[PDB]
Design a protein around this ligand. Structure first.
Ligand code: IND
Length: 163
């Protein structure tokens, strides 16, 4: 288990454009293409991302390419964010993957809502952080994925991802 296998679990793999849990056009391993309701908008973004006229279908290889880029750029965002970096650096490797997971799903702007949880995680109050984490739209809207991420933050183990 590592961040790549974890996000593969949480996001699945689809080779055609689909809508994610928010109704937004997505492809691959949860690569968000656009928030526009226009399928043409999404297809243009896909072509832009892959570098060819895909017609809304990619290969597994191409999907994994987007995925590695997306992960990399998530971590890079964290390290450039003054509010997130101190917390990510306070964390062990397992919990860091949980942090990357949340950013992958909700963005940095998503995770800004989580100041209080962030503090509790930085203080290593795992059980308190876990309770606070779940008082969130995120938990309410995607409960099973959030439970797994919270378990990972609470325990510092991959237990929620074995199987
Ligand atoms: C950096 C980015 C996202 C995060 N979620 C919980 C801790 C944390 C640190």
């Amino acid at each position: 288990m590592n961040i790549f296998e974890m996000l593969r679990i949480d996001e699945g793999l689809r080779l055609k454009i689909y809508k994610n849990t928010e109704g937004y056009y997505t492809i691959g391993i949860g690569h968000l293409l656009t928030k526009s309701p226009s399928l043409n908008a999404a297809k243009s973004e896909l072509d832009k991302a892959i570098g060819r006229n895909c017609n809304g279908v990619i290969t597994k290889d191409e999907a994994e390419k987007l995925f590695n880029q997306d992960v990399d750029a998530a971590v890079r965002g964290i390290l450039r964010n003054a509010k997130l970096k101190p917390v990510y650096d306070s964390l062990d490797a397992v919990r860091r993957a949980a942090a990357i997971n949340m950013v992958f799903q909700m963005g940095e702007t998503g995770v800004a809502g989580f100041t209080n949880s962030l503090r509790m995680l930085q203080q290593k109050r795992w059980d308190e952080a876990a309770v606070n984490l779940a008082k969130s739209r995120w938990y309410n809207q995607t409960p099973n994925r959030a439970k797994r991420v919270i378990t990972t933050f609470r325990t510092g183990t991959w237990d929620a991802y074995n199987n």
